Design a protein around this ligand. Structure first.
Ligand SMILES: [Zn+2]
Ligand SMILES: [Zn+2]
Lengths: 153, 153
């Protein structure tokens, strides 16, 4: 019913659009959209603490632990509330994503409205890769585009 | 006592970052922050209805007229219930923003919490200078970085 709007912008050809389709205000959300200006294969994809992403990296570090676990989800079980999978792109420069989930809803100033999403440079491990750091971020690499989430209904 | 953090990007190294603080939910508010990557001189800046700003015009056009008004304010008697005037940048490529207003506040999805903003690479004409487009947008002459409004509380 109520669609939210996440607008990620990097640099020229780099963007990330995601709509969040929610039917009331605390129930589960159907999520989809296109992250373009990528190279083919997987790219890490996380909802951070806050909507600050303006002091560059001096803002969103790794992805928020509000439930007190590691990075994960599409292969790991524990998973941050700040993790909506990874965006796997084609050679036409785009990852067009499709998801449905019951760990967030369009609720207040702290859920996924007023919040930040990050898209990463490379593929995400989603748990414990080959190193310590992979438990923090997924080892997904640097960030390109950044964006904030507001209401589109 | 909720502080915001909007993130505009897209025109490569151009960003538009604006903050706010809410002293009481119904009072006036000081906006602050910086728009950087700009040439020196004036640049128009507008909050719109919704946080909807993904691809461009299909995700919102001009700054909405809920009272069915013209644009303007700092030289005009109208002003939309969701717009501001213009900024100016110094030759480091940056506009300082440190402005007051007594009609926006951080309260509800349609206020500045939950909303969108775009800044413009030319001056704004505020309701009327020359043409139709003065009374419509604000004659703002060009786009630049666009974004959704974020919260750090
Ligand atoms: Zn994570
Ligand atoms: Zn206006």
């Amino acid at each position: 019913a109520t669609k939210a709007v996440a607008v990620l912008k990097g640099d020229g050809p780099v963007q990330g659009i995601i709509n969040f389709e929610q039917k009331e205000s605390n129930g589960p959300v159907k999520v989809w959209g296109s992250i373009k200006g990528l190279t083919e294969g997987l790219h890490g994809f996380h909802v951070h603490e806050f909507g600050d992403n303006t002091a560059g990296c001096t803002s969103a570090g790794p992805h928020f632990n509000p439930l007190s676990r590691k990075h994960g989800g599409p292969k790991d079980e524990e998973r941050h509330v700040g993790d909506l999978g990874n965006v796997t792109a084609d050679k036409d420069g785009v990852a067009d994503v499709s998801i449905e989930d019951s760990v967030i809803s369009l609720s207040g100033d702290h859920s996924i409205i007023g919040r930040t999403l990050v898209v990463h440079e490379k593929a995400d491990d989603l748990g414990k890769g080959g190193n310590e750091e992979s438990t923090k971020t997924g080892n997904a690499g640097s960030r390109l585009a950044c964006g904030v989430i507001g209401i589109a209904q």
